[PDB]
């Protein structure tokens, strides 16, 4: 079914699954932990709505989510901050600037947002990229399951190209922009690693959702 979707249907589905922008409830790290915790609940419901994801075993769904959760949070943050040069819009009521920064990661996030601004990243491209993160980040650490995932990934590639072609990009511009978008994903992975190790360095091991947590949330 996922493999029968057109580009317009794929975009429509991902746009409908988009979580809302949440507000901070009001310690910088208290606030961010509580925000992420609330974001995670919406992320599970979002992931179930990504075409092809629920065709996977529950075990494989958890492994993909376990590997991608912080990259997904970060790319959302970068998207929200895109119109606020030099600032990070964690929430509409939590909009931070460097001197409030951790500052090495804070600067990497700002560089990503500047890059999205520079490329005029569009909302329909953003949701395709967040779905690529979900399906790609853990596929190389798991046979028919991994084949299905690559076929779904191929569909999201097709969707990205169709979006660009209808926006009037030439064939050359289409492939160049596809590569530019996917190459930023390597920087998002790097930032998630940096974030993970800093969650560790802070005495915050415990805040990372476990395999069993994600499994139970998926079951719920």
**99 forms part of the interface with a copy of itself (CB under 8 A):** no
Rg (CA), the chain: 17
Q: What would the two tokens of residue 217 be?
A: 């949330």
Binder of residue 199, out of a copy of itself, ligand A1AHV, none (CB less than 5 to 8 A by kind) = ligand A1AHV
Question: What tokens does 90 get?
Answer: 């964690």
CB-CB contact of 52 with 152 (8 Å): yes
Report the run of H or E that residue 88 belongs to, with start and end: strand 87-91
DSSP per-residue letters across 11-63: HHHHHHTPPPPPPP---HHHHHHHHHHHHHHHHHHHHHTSTTGGGS-HHHHHH
Identify residues after which the chain is interrupted (C–N over 2.5 A).
Answer: 26, 101, 142
Q: Does 213 bind ligand A1AHV (CB under 6 A)?
A: no
> Please, what is the minimum distance in Å from the beta carbon of residue 193 to a copy of itself?
4
Q: Which is nearer to ligand A1AHV, 59 or 198 (CB)?
A: 198
> 61: which residues sit within 8 A by CB, 6+ positions away?
47, 53, 54, 218
195 binds, among a copy of itself, ligand A1AHV, none (CB under 5 to 8 A by kind): ligand A1AHV
For residues 22 and 72, which CB has a smaller minimum distance to a copy of itself in the complex? 72
CA dihedral 200, 206, 211, 213 (to 10 degrees): -150
| Contact status: 175 vs a copy of itself (CB under 8 A) | yes
- Decide which of a copy of itself, ligand A1AHV, none touches 113; Cβ closer than 5 to 8 Å per partner kind: none
Which stretch, 32-40, 127-135, 151-159, 169-177, contacts ligand A1AHV (CB under 6 A)? 32-40
With binding defined as CB under 8 A, does residue 170 bind a copy of itself? no
- From the list 48, 60, 46, the residue with the least C-alpha distance to 149 is 60
206 makes contact, choosing from a copy of itself, ligand A1AHV, none, with CB < 5 to 8 Å by partner type, with none
- Minimum CB distance to ligand A1AHV, residue 7 (Å): 28
Residues forming the annotated binding site for 17beta-estradiol? 39, 80, 198
- Give the residues lining the site for a copy of itself (CB under 8 A): 107-108, 111-112, 115, 132, 136-137, 140-141, 150, 153-154, 157-158, 161, 171-172, 174-176, 178-180, 182-190, 193-194, 197
């Amino acid at each position: 079914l996922a493999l029968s979707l057109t580009a317009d249907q794929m975009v429509s589905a991902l746009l409908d699954a988009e979580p809302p922008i949440l507000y901070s409830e009001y310690s910088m790290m208290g606030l961010l932990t509580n925000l992420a915790d609330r974001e995670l609940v919406h992320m599970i419901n979002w992931a179930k709505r990504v075409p092809g994801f629920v065709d996977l075993t529950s075990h494989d769904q958890v492994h993909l989510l376990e590997c991608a959760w912080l990259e997904i949070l970060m790319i959302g943050l970068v998207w929200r901050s895109m119109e606020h040069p030099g600032k990070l819009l964690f929430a509409p009521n939590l909009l931070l600037d460097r001197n409030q920064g951790m500052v090495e990661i804070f600067d990497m996030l700002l560089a990503t947002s500047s890059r999205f601004r520079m490329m005029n990243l569009q909302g329909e491209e953003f949701v395709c990229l967040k779905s690529i993160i979900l399906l790609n980040s853990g596929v190389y650490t798991f046979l028919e399951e991994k084949d299905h995932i690559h076929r779904v990934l191929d569909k999201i590639t097709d969707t990205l190209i169709h979006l660009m072609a209808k926006a009037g990009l030439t064939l050359q511009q289409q492939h160049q922009r596809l590569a530019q978008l996917l190459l930023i994903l390597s920087h998002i992975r790097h930032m998630s690693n940096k974030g993970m190790e800093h969650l560790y360095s802070m005495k915050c091991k415990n805040v990372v959702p476990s395999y069993d947590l994600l499994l139970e949330m998926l079951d719920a």
